[PDB]
């Protein structure tokens, strides 16, 4: 649904 960008 929502993200704030990929971790690593």
């Amino acid at each position, epitope marked *: *649904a929502v993200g704030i960008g990929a971790v*690593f």
Partner: antibody
Amino acid sequence: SQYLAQSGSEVKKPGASVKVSCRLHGDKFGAHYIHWVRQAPGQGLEWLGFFHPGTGDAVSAQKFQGRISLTRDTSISTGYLEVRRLSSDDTAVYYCARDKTYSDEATGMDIWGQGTTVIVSS
Amino acid sequence: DIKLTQSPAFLSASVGERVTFTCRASQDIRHELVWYQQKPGRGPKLLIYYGSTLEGGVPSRFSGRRSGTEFTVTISSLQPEDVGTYYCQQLNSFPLTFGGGTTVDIRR
């Protein structure tokens, strides 16, 4: 153990600003998203925003947009919530919480800070 | 805002009784829904995510079910440590809204 340690209780006058701090212990600060949530006395939970602790990218709820800012300092693994132009409606316990962050998306807040009460009063 | 409607607002039952409460999303939120348990005097704690998945540490007595936009939790046998307020949250679209909560207590 992975825990979130927050700053202690605050008292602020109407119109002032507050800044709450949340420090992540026991893991990589950049591995998971981190949320801010607040609960006013006798009321339910309210989502404020969340952020990318590695990149600094953040999103705040439309209601609070322009009124709050979510930052972090990677050197110390610490997030910050600043709320400006305070009123009585901002009295609450403010929580930071780690998200499970599955599939590079909001998955659920699995680790909660103990919260910091912020009292807006004269 | 997607609105989450929880029912009932208050729920009372005896120890060992089976209980269910509901969270209803104003629109389709897929499986992106989560539950938190808040014990009295304490902070919220992660219970169920992806609508049906139990968090680690959470007893088998808990389960969750999705039917369309309707999400329910079932406690097979209620115990005193289950007492508190349960909140559902949608993770589907901004802002990520909370339900109004359902407060569970022990009936005597």
